[PDB]
Amino acid sequence: QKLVRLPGLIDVHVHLREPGGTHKEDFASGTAAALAGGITMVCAMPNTRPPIIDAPALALAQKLAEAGARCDFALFLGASSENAGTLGTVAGSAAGLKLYLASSHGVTSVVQWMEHFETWPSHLPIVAHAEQQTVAAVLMVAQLTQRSVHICHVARKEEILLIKAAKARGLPVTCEVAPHHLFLSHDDLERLGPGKGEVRPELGSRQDVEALWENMAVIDCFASDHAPHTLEEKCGSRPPPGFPGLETMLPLLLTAVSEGRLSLDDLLQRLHHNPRRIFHLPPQEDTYVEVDLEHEWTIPSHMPFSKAHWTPFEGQKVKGTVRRVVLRGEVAYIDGQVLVPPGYGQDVRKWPQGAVPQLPP
Template sequence: MHLREPGQTHKEDFSSGTAAALSGGVTTVLAMPNTKPPLVDADSFQLALDAAAQKAYCDYGIFAGANLTNAAEIPAVAPHAAGLKMYLDVTFGPLLLDDTTAWMQHFEHWPTARPIVAHAEGANIPALIFVANLFNRPVHICHVARRAEIEMIRAAKEKGYPVTCEVGPHHLFLSSDDFERLSQNGKYPGRKEV
């Protein structure tokens, strides 16, 4: 869940996000690390922990964020983190991991008892599964959006690779065919395929 705290509370915060979750029957949320500042070190992670402790209405976990330089230090927050989130494709903010060497450093340093989840698309999906397999680690791929990506993950699972994934309802039910009806002054184009 993108609770946007710290730094973007005009969009969402722990109070509004967890209250909305409860009103929809959701009793636990997991906050993403792409905040301002991003949750990539002990200090920024503590800001989110403090905000959640004061404002959350339901159970919560907070993901630590991987970046190009924090593989050795971010494991310090692992005991308090829901897991490590890796952004391997275009994302908002400074969390893009566009170097597979950095991926491998995170797989090497992040505690094996804590999950690694990733935003990965297209060719990065088999590359991610390969790296996870090198380190004998499971990996969860977030919000898969294309049929070909699901097929790659299915093939990896059939070969015994420990990979899981999820999809968002908007990726299942919306496409570029819905663009005109849903667009806001030409922003937010949909995808052609699922």
């Protein structure tokens, strides 16, 4: 068929596990998974080992990413029980601040949330892992401190309808939804098993999944929440939560597009334009993705690149394939082969156009 050209897509929620969890994934394998999924820019979460909750850990993570990343990236800082008010000099160099309100870096009191909202620079992003009533609680803190907040992986009818009500009142809140909460449900827990199927937020009911689709207008971004764990860990005694998702996100969503569940533009708003404008991420010159919307295939037991080496979407039929990715003028991916080496990717916050504009302080 004739290929469809897309801009370089952005995933604002990936866990690349480097430093400290490199058997699950590292920058080189995670960004290869990204490129294979049509993603040319990722925002990596801070719950690594050591966690990115201070300047030295950020300095280390930056060098590991610059040395191992194959696509471009930005790095989140994590809010901790100790670092409120201490991140002012490095905050602008990060993708944003992740507030983990379920990895929590010791944050346990709403008063600590307030301190972070008061001290983190007001022009820079804050994203929150907040489930069920926690969405309401963190929105309240955002209002008290009169600033915006971005809600990670919305998974429930309860949560999306709450955000819907907040937007109707004109509040500055945006949100993202991950593909497993659009394409998997309780109906899949029998096949997956209790170990494999462990994820946070957990899989929703059919009614939850139906509510997210019905309220697509409320969803600002799609993001994978790529959370790689080995099969041994997912099936073991204390299964960690999370799915790998970089290599399956776009095929799943392209399938929905070909079925008329959302438009191609609807998809590009949520994987390109809205991530750009929420996180102030720069364009990528000479960067685009070529996909084939006619190719039907079945998702295998594991995708080629993620070290997780498993996938909960196994056996699902998809229509849509990433055929070629060009990143800043170089062929990065073609028909299953990655052609840019570790270290090709760059930190977008170091580009002149990647700094977040602010009033002169």
